[PDB]
């Protein structure tokens, strides 16, 4: 519908599933991302965990959890970080340029960025023909959040998944 190349997109296609296709560059470097916080109390024991909600958590927007570690959740018991029980989903982003051969004119190429969650990571080297899919997400304030205005530029967009 929703069939679109990246050149034709924004905004009627925003907050709607999308299949982009084009060349992928430059393929940002693979990096961990924290999700589940896991801790151990002693001698009170039990097992204690926090759940970290990032910007790309689930899909839907949620009140941001981050950051750092809970560190003496009541009562005053010590909490050591338990590494290797706690869950880390890998995370990456890769920008996508429209196909060079369907470019209309000497007009400059327009690329948009795709975040690749979990398994999808490291599945594509840069310069490869790719048809991404994903939900088209607009993240970040446009500057409206603070109280400085700055300029008119705003609401950078990217695709989650998929």
């Amino acid at each position: 519908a929703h069939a679109l190349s990246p050149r034709t997109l924004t905004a009627q296609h925003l907050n709607k599933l999308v299949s982009v296709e084009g060349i992928v560059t430059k393929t940002s470097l693979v990096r961990p991302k924290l999700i589940r916080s896991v801790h151990y109390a002693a001698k009170t024991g039990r097992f204690h965990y926090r759940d970290y909600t990032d910007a790309t958590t689930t899909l839907t927007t949620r009140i941001p959890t981050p950051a750092i570690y809970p560190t003496e959740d009541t009562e005053g018991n010590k909490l050591t970080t338990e590494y290797g029980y706690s869950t880390f989903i890998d995370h990456q982003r890769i920008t996508v340029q429209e196909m060079p051969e369907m470019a209309p004119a000497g007009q400059l190429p327009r690329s948009i960025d795709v975040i690749l969650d979990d398994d999808l990571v490291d599945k594509t080297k840069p310069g490869d023909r790719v048809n991404v899919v994903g939900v088209f997400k607009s993240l970040g304030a446009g500057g409206m959040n603070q109280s400085n205005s700055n300029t008119l530029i705003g609401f950078k967009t990217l695709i989650l998944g998929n």
Binding site: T10, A11, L14, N15, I23, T25, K26, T27, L59, T60, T61, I63, P64, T95, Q97, P100, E101, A103, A105, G106, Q107, L108, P109, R110, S111, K125, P126, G127, D128, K137, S138, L139, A141, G142, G143, M144, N145, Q146, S147, N148, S149, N150, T151, L152, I153, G154, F155, K156, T157
Partner: protein
């Protein structure tokens, strides 16, 4: 806000009651716009000011506080037209273009800020789209207040009230309605008023339906409000921009789509009328160089180049291509460097790059980092590329070319992009030969660098010269005397247009036509005829080279001859080749062979003196010695020094 009710009632009464005798232009502008799903309206101010002077009195007073009450005013109208009840319907954008009085770019200084300003300038580059917001929901980090904020325009901070604080409001992006934005940046026209200074460029934000309306480089006349933004870079120093409502391009200037794979109808008619000309080929060969005299072989060769050729996708993956190549190489006065400018004009998609490319764009396909930056071989894919100083091109991309021209595909392994794209271009190159006529006395090849391989890849090589004949020289001269004044010679082309010749504005459309429509194929007797051709070539010219006569023959050349036959077949437009048709081609390429066919003082070559009684060890000399010894001797060129060196190397001295 009863006043806004009072204003909007006047805008509704302006849309519903407006009458140009007798259709309602606006009201139907609306319907015919919602049906195509345009969701826009274009008001004509003259009608507006005709209707009430008042609402234009306020609209030229405080535009940015009013115009959105006009938007809501019109979308409240489309609610009563496009649908009926007893969704969703975005608030339409209005685009108003009107005459007024043009206010040049230099003359914008304050004082009219927030007052609608019509003006005119050439757009430089268009900025990549980005979304602003229109309607976005917001929830609180704590009390979780659900607030739907209608943002308008008319930067705007979020409300802090339902600890709580200071600004506990999150943007919900799952329900938020977004629009688009552009950022044109426009340089005022070069005619007026640059004087001695570089012309200023005001930054403009197009939005919604005006976005991507204009290709960068096209003259336009913008309307829009004039206003200022902050953008920390004191004190206070706020910087100027022009919001656009709404843009209107000049009538002619690549309004699009000047490139339609189908064209019109009457065009097929008159084309198919041109296919019926016996002198069609002949009259075309007269279209290309109205100005350029002589050089008929080149003159025809251009024609057979533009028309493409046989293109085969046949299995396996190997695909033969079209169309050929052309070398104009020769001493100046050949007009080749001008001729290229002409081909560049005619060819449907063409890029003239002499280099080494020029200026900041790499010679064709180019790797630039944020990906393919698009260049000659790229930006000009599927068509003609014009190159000059072909011998003066850099090494690393020379490889790229040599590999490209045959398989049409160039592989780029640079950095994080290993892409393997596709250049369907057919290179037309004009080299500059060295030392003049003696290079003809020299072996015909051996010219380009140390290697003839270049000339091997190239199918049609034309050695030319600025030959002077009193007959012809008086022809060209007298022609120029005519050119200066009394001026009126360039009319001959025009009566050629009335009587016979093609306007070249039409030639292009024609070329596109023939290029897409039909793909020619050769006949068997023509084939065997060309077999005889090539075996006679091989045998005879071998016999010629029994003596080790220094010059060549490749099956690639044969393939060229083929591509010429299909090209010319595609001129007639016929789906099939004929024998005589080829009979032209053989001879034409024969002229090319004649070009393939065509003592030394030895002064400099007398490197013996140095090698001897100067240096038995050769050391402490080498290329260095030859310099100092020939550096202040008024004497030695790089090719000269090497030639004499290579010469003596070979000579065995």
């Amino acid at each position: 806000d009863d006043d806004n009710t009072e204003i909007i009632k006047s805008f509704k009464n302006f849309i519903l009651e407006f009458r140009l005798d007798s259709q309602f232009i606006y009201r139907d502008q609306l319907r015919n716009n919602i049906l195509v799903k345009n969701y826009s309206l274009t008001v004509n101010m003259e009608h507006l000011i005709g209707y009430n002077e008042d609402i234009y009195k306020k609209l030229s007073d405080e535009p940015s506080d009013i115009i959105p009450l006009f938007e809501t005013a019109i979308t409240q109208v489309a609610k009563r037209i496009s649908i009926l009840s007893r969704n969703s319907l975005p608030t339409f954008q209005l685009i108003l273009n009107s005459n007024a009085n043009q206010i040049p770019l230099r003359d914008l200084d304050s004082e009219h800020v927030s007052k609608i300003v019509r003006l005119s300038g050439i757009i430089i580059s268009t900025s990549v789209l980005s979304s602003r917001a229109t309607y976005l929901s917001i929830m609180c980090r704590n009390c979780r207040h659900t607030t739907s904020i209608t943002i308008n325009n008319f930067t705007v901070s979020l409300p802090r009230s339902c600890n709580c604080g200071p600004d506990p409001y999150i943007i919900i992006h799952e329900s938020s309605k977004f629009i688009d934005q552009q950022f044109l940046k426009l340089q005022e026209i070069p005619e007026l008023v640059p004087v001695g200074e570089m012309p200023r460029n005001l930054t403009m934000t197009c939005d919604r339906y005006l976005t991507n309306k204009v290709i960068p480089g096209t003259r336009v006349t913008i309307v829009g409000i004039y206003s200022i933004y902050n953008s920390k870079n004191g004190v206070a120093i706020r910087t100027p921009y022009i919001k656009i409502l709404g843009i209107q391009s000049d009538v002619e200037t690549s309004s699009i789509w000047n490139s339609v794979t189908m064209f019109t109808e009457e065009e097929e008619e008159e084309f198919l009328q041109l296919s019926r000309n016996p002198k069609l080929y002949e009259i075309l060969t007269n279209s290309i160089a109205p100005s350029i005299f002589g050089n008929e072989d080149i003159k025809k060769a251009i024609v057979c180049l533009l028309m493409g050729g046989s293109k085969k996708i046949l299995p396996d993956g190997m695909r033969l291509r079209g169309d050929i190549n052309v070398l104009l190489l020769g001493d100046p006065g050949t007009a080749k460097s001008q001729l290229l400018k002409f081909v560049e004009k005619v060819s449907p998609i063409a890029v003239y790059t002499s280099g080494k490319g020029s200026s900041a764009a790499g010679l064709t396909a180019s790797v630039q980092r944020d990906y393919l930056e698009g260049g000659a071989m790229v930006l000009a894919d599927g068509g003609v590329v014009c190159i000059d100083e072909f011998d003066k091109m850099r090494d690393e991309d020379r490889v790229a070319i040599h590999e490209a021209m045959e398989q049409q595909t160039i592989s780029i392994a640079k950095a994080g992009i290993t892409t393997v794209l596709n250049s369907r271009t057919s290179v037309l190159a004009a080299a500059n030969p060295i030392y003049g006529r003696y290079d003809d006395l020299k072996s015909p090849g051996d010219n380009i660098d140390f290697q003839t391989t270049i000339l091997s890849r190239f199918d049609m090589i034309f050695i030319v010269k600025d030959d002077h004949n009193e007959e012809r020289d008086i022809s060209i001269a007298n022609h120029v005397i005519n050119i200066h004044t009394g001026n009126a010679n360039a009319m001959q082309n025009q009566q050629e247009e009335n009587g016979s010749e093609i306007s070249i504005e039409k030639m292009k459309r024609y070329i596109t036509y023939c290029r897409l429509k039909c793909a020619p194929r050769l006949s068997p007797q023509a084939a065997e005829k060309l077999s005889s051709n090539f075996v006679t070539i091989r045998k005879q010219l071998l016999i010629n080279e029994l003596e080790s006569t220094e010059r060549p023959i490749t099956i690639r050349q044969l393939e060229a001859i083929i591509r010429i036959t299909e090209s010319l077949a595609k001129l007639e437009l016929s789906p099939i080749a004929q024998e005589r048709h080829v009979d032209e081609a053989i001879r034409l390429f024969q002229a090319s062979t004649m070009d393939a066919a065509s003592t030394s003082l030895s002064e400099i070559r007398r490197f013996e003196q140095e090698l001897k009684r100067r240096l038995p060890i050769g050391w402490s000399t080498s290329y260095q010695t030859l310099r100092r010894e020939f550096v202040d001797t008024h004497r030695f060129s790089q090719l000269a020094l090497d030639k004499a060196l290579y010469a003596l190397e070979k000579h065995e001295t």
